Amino acid sequence: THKVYVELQELVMDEKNQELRWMEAARWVQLEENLGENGAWGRPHLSHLTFWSLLELRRVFTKGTVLLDLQETSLAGVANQLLDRFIFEDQIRPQDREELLRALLLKHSHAGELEALGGVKPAVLTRSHSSLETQLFCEQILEKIPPDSEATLVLVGRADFLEQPVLGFVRLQEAAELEAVELPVPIRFLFVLLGPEAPHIDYTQLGRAAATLMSERVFRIDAYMAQSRGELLHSLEGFLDCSLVLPPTDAPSEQALLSLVPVQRELLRRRYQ
Amino acid sequence: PGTHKVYVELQELVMDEKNQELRWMEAARWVQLEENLGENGAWGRPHLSHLTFWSLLELRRVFTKGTVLLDLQETSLAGVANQLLDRFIFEDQIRPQDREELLRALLLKHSHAGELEALGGVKPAVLTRSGDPSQPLLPQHSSLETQLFCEQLEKIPPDSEATLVLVGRADFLEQPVLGFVRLQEAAELEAVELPVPIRFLFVLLGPEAPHIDYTQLGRAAATLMSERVFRIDAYMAQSRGELLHSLEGFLDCSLVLPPTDAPSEQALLSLVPVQRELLRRRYQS
């Protein structure tokens, strides 16, 4: 059994060079901390999920490409095997493989490099508004991470060429320090969510949902012991069974969340049963 | 119209224990806040309506292909049932052979909490190809709200109009169906003991399916009706597309709280701005 550090990256371009790359969006250690503009992490908070993010997460996980016990120690090899499996399960077309590989092997720069760039803007991959969490918590690590920790990387991007959104779940045979993508702790799991623009599909929220799912203890244990996609799907159904949806109400916010405590406690009890 | 507050009643198609006879028993009621009915027949403490993910998922699925009777000119539940079944048949939702049993079931006795002591109790039931009740085959899940709020009406404004949500299970039905009815004139129906006129009527019928809890589906429909914005949109809806857009906006501002290992209850207060901002995006429509 291991703890987890989930890092969520997104496809952006810098302003200075106009070069496509991967930017950290949020990280999960014990609570979600989002990276706002000017390169400062926001106040830690629980991960809250939109309904559409979980709906689309289940939709892409049901048909998702899963590579359990994959023997690769580099991001290039993981991406190569993942794209081959994407072609094999008819997720992506063989013409898309080269451009998806070029996207997945870009520079994964970090928070400190944001000031070196001087600005970062979202992006859509091509052949050839601000986030709610950023608006609420970002308008204003190594010590926290346990030593026996295995990292999870969630890669999220939008590609115009892709005809449908695709999920790729990769579990390495052994944890690896990917020289392409540096993290405090070695990487074991890998989420890849790529897709065309689509209604009710916010890819940042999709990556948030995947990272929150990986942060959950029951699903993390199940994904460690999973030997097929069906076990992961069963764990996801259990995760959604114990999820609590809060509809829009006019009640006071603190009273609304305090009154949900008995029900959410019962749901946690059901989750750990 | 509306926009102040309404009374929503949810009733389930169940069978009593005295005669094993199918009927309708009220399961919950909404006056800005939900109360559930216990087995003993006493209503639980009012609480903010929390929804399950599957209930909203399946509510959207049945609403997208739902059958809508807007500005319907009937004042009785029999006429509403006849027109809804005719439109179900016209839209290829139910087969014409299902009409007799469905009309009988929809027009059965709508009992309330006062009658619950005279009967031997209420247990889950599924409508069969005939009128006979059948015990559910899938594993029945005891109600969460009954467990956490029941193990222990002057708020209605005079000008308000009620809403009735009917949920039932019939094994002969091919797929779950939704019937949304907005009456031309709000009328008192025999299904509600309270002297509040009924303007809206939700009918949710279907077979026993996994991840499909019909009590939770009715709770989701009643929570949707209890919301001010959707209620205004439903009053001003001239087509099913407007209702679908309102439900989509409702799900846009719905917040899902996933299970977590350690509930601190202090960092749960970090979801105050989330709820406030989602409500802000809701009321801008």
Which member of A216, A258, A262 has the closest CB to residue B148?
A262
Residue A23 and residue B139: Cα distance in Å, rounded? Answer: 46
Task: Extract the tokens encoding A72.
Answer: 């690769």
CB contact under 8 A, A55 and B57: yes
CB contact under 8 A, B277 and A132: yes
Instruction: Tell me how many residue pairs between chain A and chain B have CB atoms under 8 A apart.
Output: 159
Residue A235 and residue A223: Cα distance in Å, rounded? Answer: 8
CA B111 to chain centre: 16
Q: B56 contacts in A (CB within 8 Å)?
A: 51, 245
Three-class SS state of A99: helix
Residue A63 and residue A164: Cα distance in Å, rounded? Answer: 11
Task: Decide the pairing of beta strands A120-122 and A166-176.
Answer: unpaired
Which member of B229, B256, B269 has the closest CB to residue A50?
B256
Which residue, among A170, A115, A182, has the nearest Cα to A142 in the 3D structure?
A182
Residue B243 and residue B221: Cα distance in Å, rounded? Answer: 12
Phi, psi of A36 (to 5 degrees): -90, 180
Task: Extract the tokens encoding B165.
Answer: 């949500």
Q: Which residue of chain A has the CA closest to B222? A: A247
Cβ-based neighbours of A32, under 8 Å, separated by 6 or more: A26, A44, A45, A46, A47, A133, A208, A211, A212, A215
Q: Which residue of chain B has the CA closest to A271? A: B259
CB contact under 8 A, A51 and B254: yes
Residue with tokens 């709508």: B110
CA distance A211 to chain B (A): 12
CB contact under 8 A, B50 and A262: no
CA distance A113 to chain B (A): 29
Task: Extract the tokens encoding B72.
Answer: 């319907």
CA distance A45 to chain B (A): 6
CA distance B123 to chain A (A): 23
Q: Which residue of chain B has the CA closest to A243? A: B258
Domain that holds residue B212: 1-285
Cβ-based neighbours of A177, under 8 Å, separated by 6 or more: A183, A186, A187
Q: A256 contacts in B (CB within 8 Å)?
A: 48, 275
**Residue A157 β-bridge partners:** A194
CB contact under 8 A, B256 and A243: yes
**Residue B110 β-bridge partners:** B24
Cβ-based neighbours of A77, under 8 Å, separated by 6 or more: none
CB contact under 8 A, A259 and B47: yes
**Which residue out of B3, B244, B256 would a mutagenesis test of the A interface target, given it has the greatest number of A Cβ atoms within 10 Å?**
B256
**Which residue out of A28, A46, A239 would a mutagenesis test of the B interface target, given it has the greatest number of B Cβ atoms within 10 Å?**
A46
Residue A221's alpha-carbon distances to A158, A175, A188, A214, B277, in angstroms, are: 30, 16, 13, 9, 34
Q: A257 contacts in B (CB within 8 Å)?
A: 268-269, 271-272, 275
Task: Extract the tokens encoding B102.
Answer: 């469905």
Give per-residue burial for A8-26: e unless 16+ CB within 10 Å, then b. Answer: bbbbbbbeeeeebbbbbbb
Q: Which residue of chain A has the CA closest to B278? A: A248
CA distance B48 to chain A (A): 7
Task: Decide the pairing of beta strands A120-122 and A3-14.
Answer: antiparallel
CA distance A223 to chain B (A): 16
Residue A46's alpha-carbon distances to A153, A203, B255, B265, in angstroms, are: 19, 19, 12, 10
CA B218 to chain centre: 3
For every residue of chain B, which 3-state class applies, written as one string?
A: CCCCCCCEEEEEEEEECCCCCEEEEEEEEECCCEEEECCCCCECCCECCCECHHHHHHHHHHHHCCEEEEEECCCCHHHHHHHHHHHHHHCCCCCHHHHHHHHHHHCCCEECHHHHCCCCCEEECEECCCCCEECCCCCCCCCHHHHHHCCCCCCCCCCCCEEEEEEEEECCCCCCEEEEEEEEEEECCCCCCCCCCEEEEEEEEECCCCCCCHHHHHHHHHHHHHCHHHHHHHHCCCCHHHHHHHHHHHHHCCEEECCCCCCCCCCHHHHHHHHHHHHHHHHCC
Phi, psi of B166 (to 5 degrees): -115, 125
Residue A175 and residue A180: Cα distance in Å, rounded? Answer: 14
Three-class SS state of A114: helix
Residue B13 and residue B285: Cα distance in Å, rounded? Answer: 36
DSSP code per residue over A175-239? EE--SSS--SS-EEEEEEEEE---TT--HHHHHHHHHHHHHSHHHHHHHHH--SHHHHHHHHHHH
Three-class SS state of A42: coil
Number of domains in chain A: 1
Residue A184 and residue A174: Cα distance in Å, rounded? Answer: 16
Residue with tokens 């949810």: B10
| Gyration radius of chain B's alpha carbons | 18
Residue A188 and residue A6: Cα distance in Å, rounded? Answer: 10
